[PDB]
Amino acid sequence: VALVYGQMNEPPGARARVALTGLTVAEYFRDQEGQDVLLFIDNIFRFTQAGSEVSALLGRIPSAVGYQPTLATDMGTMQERITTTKKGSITSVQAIYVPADDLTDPAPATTFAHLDATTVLSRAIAELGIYPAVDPLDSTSRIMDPNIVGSEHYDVARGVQKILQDYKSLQDIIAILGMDELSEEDKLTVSRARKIQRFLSQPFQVAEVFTGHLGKLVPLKETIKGFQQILAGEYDHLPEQAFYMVGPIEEAVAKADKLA
Amino acid sequence: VALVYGQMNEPPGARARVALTGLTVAEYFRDQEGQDVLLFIDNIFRFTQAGSEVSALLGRIPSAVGYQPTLATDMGTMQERITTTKKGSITSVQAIYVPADDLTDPAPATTFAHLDATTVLSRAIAELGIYPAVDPLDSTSRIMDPNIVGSEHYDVARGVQKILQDYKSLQDIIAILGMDELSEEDKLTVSRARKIQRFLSQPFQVAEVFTGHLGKLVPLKETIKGFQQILAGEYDHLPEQAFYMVGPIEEAVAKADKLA
Amino acid sequence: ATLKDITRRLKSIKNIQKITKSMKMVAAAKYARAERELKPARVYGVGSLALYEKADIKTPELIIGVSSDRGLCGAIHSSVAKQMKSEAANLKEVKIIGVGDKIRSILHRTHSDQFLVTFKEVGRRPPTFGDASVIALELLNSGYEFDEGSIIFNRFRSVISYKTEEKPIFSLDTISSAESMSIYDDIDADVLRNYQEYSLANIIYYSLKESTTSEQSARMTAMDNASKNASEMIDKLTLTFNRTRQAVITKELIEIISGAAAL
């Protein structure tokens, strides 16, 4: 990683440009060495704000909500340099701050014009111990189209979510009226869902110096199969905790063994 | 009929003056021939908008909402020629486009004072399927005087408004909790109000292609009457739907049979 | 549309939604238990009625309304009351009893001077034969030598429907002494006295067991809706809030610019 910094004490113009500087660097590992670089802009809102400060200083009339008249171009001239050219591609993970919790606020609204996916980190999920604490129902992607990920991928994914949704429904019932008017059917959606929720968690190699556990980088193929089978009913006999913090389904099997 | 036009494709100045032009034509028949004229304008809001388009160019500090500081006087010396006099009569019907649906907008806001009768159309009503989408508690007429329309008319009129005003206040609660908790008495206003609301709608020849029904023209006494009875509880047995999209009350009874 | 008011409304609707979702789940639990205990009750209650339909009973020549004390269950009470007033009108002397405070508050004022007794503590805890026996006892120990009575309650049909019905109370030990009753012989004039008393408790019990099932399923339904309306209202006010928030800033800023530019 190369780190580029635009600290909060820097004047508008500096916090304004540092995301371009970082961009410059990344474009090299693509236009000069044709790799697949990763660009991280933390956070995309302070980019926009820096834009407004600069704008105001240049005495230009603000537009709706006080932002810059050039909000959309200031963003476009930067966002657009982030793509897959014939030489390689830059992929950007942008930390978003939504003002006033207003998703139609000009800053945020403009920004979604460019996003192809959202990764929603959730404190609730974390509380399940589940990590990465990504929310499987709130996180989204433009490319989750069978015409793009292929029917299999697309169906598994849509399978995982519905089940996760259904279980969500039952969640209310379980706690109140108690876990049993539950059908041979309603009891399976839960079981699997709970297996799934766990199978969606995973050990990171970045946290090895700490979790005393080995990181896993599951492959896409392994991912779709994994969930495919749980949906399928291939491991209904396996127990929940067999799936907590593992990589490929094979590990779910072996953990079960060590868990008698 | 004489036709004058300065449409949506003309530069501002043309739109700013065609009203004056149609107006002049009408003034000739009124004063030079003592004729009884009819003057239709669609849309007089456009004249004011046109004014706002050139106003900055004339170099004027803008007034509220970016409009020209001369908005009222411009409406005034123009609106004041659209009038009946001792020489001739001008019945004028003017469509007034309300921007963003905001009736507090300087344009529409300043126009109320020039009319004798106003028909305020509502998106909310239109969306309920009631056409014409006239707001019954927001339309008025300087003729709504017992000494002009007769007390029979004056009492049905105020009768209808009172029940719709009453329904209107119950709506907040109806909105979270529905009708259950409502008083037997309150539920009767609600029934009647919803039947009066439907009976206020009607099929226009001009809108036959959309209502799917044959246009109707109801004679005043038929209106005064049909509304009396409704008020008077003579149809508390019919269903609401019987009243929707009909002319005379007699057709509302029939529709009820057909609904069986 | 004031960010203050909007906020005031959101505040009270978020609580409503919370209290309303809670009430729904409690009800659905009470309902679930009630739906089941109702299976046997019907067979039992229908059994009690098996004698009279299987063989005529009329009357030569007491309106009991059952519901509960708690509202927020759609039209459970208004229905029985509505039909209760209807009878008292069409009718022969008139005397009435209401089980569940709500009846005593609704089909009331107009007919207080037309009361015999009223019952409280109905609906919170599941009804029992025991409660029915108290109602029956309270009546037998009343000075009303009713010749014929009717019992009005809500007959369950499904979580989304019920029907207010009436059941005849030919409890008149006197009426059970008609021609049609000649088919059954070897009946002491006072063995019936016991028979009628009993079948009186059975019919009150039945209506009672039907009633809470209708009530808990209607409160569940009513509170499902209320809660869903609330949330929708919440979603709308919030979006109205942001539109307003953005326009005030924009509006306040254009005003400053206009003043500044004019100089």
Added chain:
Amino acid sequence: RQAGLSYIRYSQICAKAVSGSTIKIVKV
């Protein structure tokens, strides 16, 4: 009977020997 007791009351006793009580009187 004659002692003031009725049959429901008898059945009550008999059944208990072999049952809520929530209901409350409101006499006015």
Added chain:
Amino acid sequence: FTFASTQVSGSVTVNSVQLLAEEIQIRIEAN
């Protein structure tokens, strides 16, 4: 035959048959 109380003294009826089962002296008799 239909026999019930909560569960599926009292009364009995023969028309189809139905049996329906729910101061000191009475108690003595029962016990």
